[PDB]
Structure 1
């Protein structure tokens, strides 16, 4: 439901309005041709015009397909790629990959196949585009078009930019709403943080902390921040909309009182990726419990409620006793200097509680006091049943290790150590991260699974930053606002908005 005059709102500005952007934009190689979604498409579209650069883009696309291809079908896809791109007489022959590297893969495919067979060649291709083909695209109309999109991205975001519909859930310092961008129509989840509730409770640094962490991290398994604006009496965070309910609901209301091992395996594999992306920013979540694992419309999961997340300084440990009863690692209950370990303890609580149907330290029918639940986390060894395969028992007790020094994933290797666990012996992570594995449960669409100080003005400056770059560009692509607006002159000629002669 895009606005009536959305083409006027997203109307491209004349390229002369983008001179300040031309020189302030860092021209990093693939910060503009890969990371930034629209930038990637425009550079790709720049190569579509050239005959030589054409075949280099088609090759990379074919390599991406090989990485997710099933195992028994690798040797097949492998041959197709070489006979199409690496044969010297091909119509789409790759040249900048030296003959001393096409004969290399000749030996790779002569043996068993590995999903990273063409990795050597792919890097060689990018290394070529990084040079002349990139600097050419910089002086091309597509980069001028890229600046036009950036101009729109940076525009101020206010309240008329959106269209709240209902209040879906309420929590601390505010509540959550269902927000919609008018010009694009995309549905988001607004987070109305009441302004006078923050200053009273003196939690201004905790609000910023979550807002900075959310914008810095993007992922398919953690709620993303697309906008952050200030308003009268409230401060808003525009986050991903999750209509599939939480994992607590599906474990106890719509299961056994639990899941099958294979079903829990899926959700676990996605949660692990969600934690890996948060650790790439050396950020610890510390709030891993079933009601915080939400499901989207397709059946996939994301982590939410990062209010307790904090960015750990590299080589430094934090101290704090936060979390929810039962889901606090022993090192957190002890109030010690810990790192990212509490999340792997939480992941152990999650996998266990999904398969068995109860907390590993409190029965579903047991009524115990906070003190006793805590003693078991520190003094009691969990017990397993015939619902856990020998691989499912191992990962849970390894992740539920009391001593965070011998806990899985808490080594220099990180989350990579967990993915290699036999419990994920049947999980292809490259295909999961690509969204190619069908979720085990698909939520139904109609389902309903449920004062004037100046210092206050200074705190707003760092919060109300505006639209987040990557989520914003994707929104333009999702809503097909890019497909419609990204139009040029007929027969590869400059359009009016990109002609410095007549504005």
Structure 2
């Protein structure tokens, strides 16, 4: 459902228009050839023109495949890779990996295989490519084409950039609509923030902080910000659309109430990966409750409503009695200086609630006052049923430790400590982070599961498209596949030749 003339909207600018970009973009290898999707694809395409470099890209692809390979199939896929890329006589032999290291990798194959057997060789390969091949790519037509894609990426976004549809959510400071990009046809969820209520409540810093946290998170298990733009009578936040409903609905309306332990394990693993991604940017969520975990069309989950999140300064603690009744950790109720620990408390509350079909401190069929719920959270120890395996009891108990200092995942090791827990013993996180494990519930497509100071504030909010989400949008809609064309037989196309603009 792309606009009639979408090819004219995303028409590449002549390379001569990107000179200012050329001398401004930081020529970082990991950014330009890995993190940025379109840059990664273009660098791989450059390597696909050189017999010498092709084999290294193929190798890294096969290593990526090996990491997610099932355990029983590791020794097989290992040998393959070996006898194909690392034997001296191979049409795809890679030499820049020291023969030394080849004879050291054979060893680890001669013993038990691990999912990290080729990490050494892959790092060697990246070191090779970070050098001469990268700098050649920089003086290549593929990097010019990357600059053209960057130019498009930075263009101003407006209301006309989008095509708003239906109001599919509501809230406090505004509402949540569904909006499509006319040029690409990709669907998103607009979060419309009414400028009036924001000026009144003086919530400038809160809306801004939410926008910054959303734009700086790049996770498969949290809602991503794609665009932040302004209009008349509102500001907008364009985020991941989630049409599969929320976890509260599936626990209570579609549940027993509750789930089988294994289904809850899938969801808990995905939520833990989301929290890990948030903790990499030392950001604390503090709003972990089942209605804020959303499902997508494929059955996977993402954390939503970051309006309560806070970027914690490293080495510093914050204070704030915020959240939802019944999902506030003890240190939060006591209004103490805390760190990321509230979130792990939340995680516990969710696993419990997923398995048992009720909160650990309030019965589903119970009617109590906020004060008694809080007293239970601070003094009462929760009880477990036969719906919990011993491992599940364990992880819930450790996450529901009242002393944030002794709570699982609140050490310097972080979420890793939780991923190792016996509760997750049958969970391959490499395959989950790669999207390779089938979700336990797949929603049906057709389903429906429900002044001048202000000017300066807007300037810092309405920053336009976000880089990684924009490029991923371009790829998913096949805009990139369609426009990324060159000259017949590996030659310069007109938009990249400086001779005849």
Q: What is the TM-score of this pair, normalised by structure 1?
A: 0.99
CA-to-aligned-CA distance 1:274-301 (integer Å, 9 cap, x gap): 0000000000000000000000000000
Shift of 1:132: 0.2
What residue is the counterpart of 1:479 in the other structure? 477
CA distance in 1, matches of 2:30, 2:403: 42
Q: Could you list the runs of 5+ residues in structure 1 that have no partner in the other structure?
A: none
CA distance in 1, matches of 2:29, 2:151: 20
CA distance in 1, matches of 2:366, 2:397: 21
Shift of 1:30: 1.6
Shift of 1:428: 0.1
CA-to-aligned-CA distance 1:193-231 (integer Å, 9 cap, x gap): 000010001110000000000000111100000000000
* Secondary structure of the corresponding residue to residue 305 of structure 1: coil
* Secondary structure of the corresponding residue to residue 192 of structure 2: strand
* Secondary structure of the corresponding residue to residue 192 of structure 1: strand
CA distance in 2, matches of 1:227, 1:377: 39
CA-to-aligned-CA distance 1:213-252 (integer Å, 9 cap, x gap): 0000111100000000000000000000000000000000
* Secondary structure of the corresponding residue to residue 464 of structure 2: coil
Shift of 1:256: 0.7
CA-to-aligned-CA distance 1:298-353 (integer Å, 9 cap, x gap): 00000000000000000000000000000000000000000000000000000000
CA distance in 1, matches of 2:202, 2:195: 11
CA distance in 2, matches of 1:422, 1:205: 41
* Secondary structure of the corresponding residue to residue 157 of structure 1: coil
CA distance in 2, matches of 1:460, 1:160: 18
CA-to-aligned-CA distance 1:160-194 (integer Å, 9 cap, x gap): 10000001110011110001000000000000000
Equivalences for residues 421-432 of structure 1 within 5 A: 421-432=421-432
Q: What is the TM-score of this pair, normalised by structure 2?
A: 1.00
CA distance in 2, matches of 1:243, 1:5: 29
* Secondary structure of the corresponding residue to residue 324 of structure 1: coil
Are residue 439 (structure 1) and residue 435 (structure 2) matched?
A: no
Shift of 1:481: 0.1
What residue is the counterpart of 1:490 in the other structure? 488
What residue is the counterpart of 1:395 in the other structure? 395
Alignment RMSD (CA, Å): 0.3
CA-to-aligned-CA distance 1:420-460 (integer Å, 9 cap, x gap): 0000000000000000000000000011101xx10000000
CA distance in 2, matches of 1:13, 1:138: 19
CA distance in 1, matches of 2:31, 2:500: 31
CA distance in 1, matches of 2:214, 2:378: 32
CA distance in 2, matches of 1:314, 1:216: 16
Equivalences for residues 219-298 of structure 1 within 5 A: 219-298=219-298
CA distance in 1, matches of 2:144, 2:109: 42
Shift of 1:29: 1.0
What residue is the counterpart of 1:464 in the other structure? 462
CA distance in 2, matches of 1:98, 1:280: 33
CA distance in 1, matches of 2:296, 2:418: 25
CA-to-aligned-CA distance 1:246-284 (integer Å, 9 cap, x gap): 000000000110100000000000000000000000000
CA distance in 1, matches of 2:171, 2:65: 43
CA distance in 2, matches of 1:232, 1:166: 19
CA distance in 1, matches of 2:205, 2:100: 56
Shift of 1:99: 0.6
CA-to-aligned-CA distance 1:29-77 (integer Å, 9 cap, x gap): 1200000000000000000000000000000000000000000000000
CA distance in 2, matches of 1:310, 1:126: 35
Shift of 1:487: 0.2
* Secondary structure of the corresponding residue to residue 185 of structure 1: coil
Shift of 1:405: 0.2
Shift of 1:4: 0.2
What residue is the counterpart of 1:13 in the other structure? 13
Q: Any runs of at least 4 consecutive aligned residues in structure 1 with deviations exceeding 6 A, and if so which?
A: none
- How many pairs were matched up? 501
Shift of 1:411: 0.2
Q: Could you list the runs of 5+ residues in structure 2 that have no partner in the other structure?
A: none
What residue is the counterpart of 1:76 in the other structure? 76
What residue is the counterpart of 1:109 in the other structure? 109
Equivalences for residues 98-497 of structure 1 within 5 A: 98-450=98-450, 453-497=451-495
CA-to-aligned-CA distance 1:149-168 (integer Å, 9 cap, x gap): 00000000000100000011
CA distance in 2, matches of 1:70, 1:429: 12
CA distance in 2, matches of 1:23, 1:337: 45
* Secondary structure of the corresponding residue to residue 270 of structure 2: helix
CA distance in 2, matches of 1:335, 1:54: 57
CA distance in 2, matches of 1:475, 1:169: 23
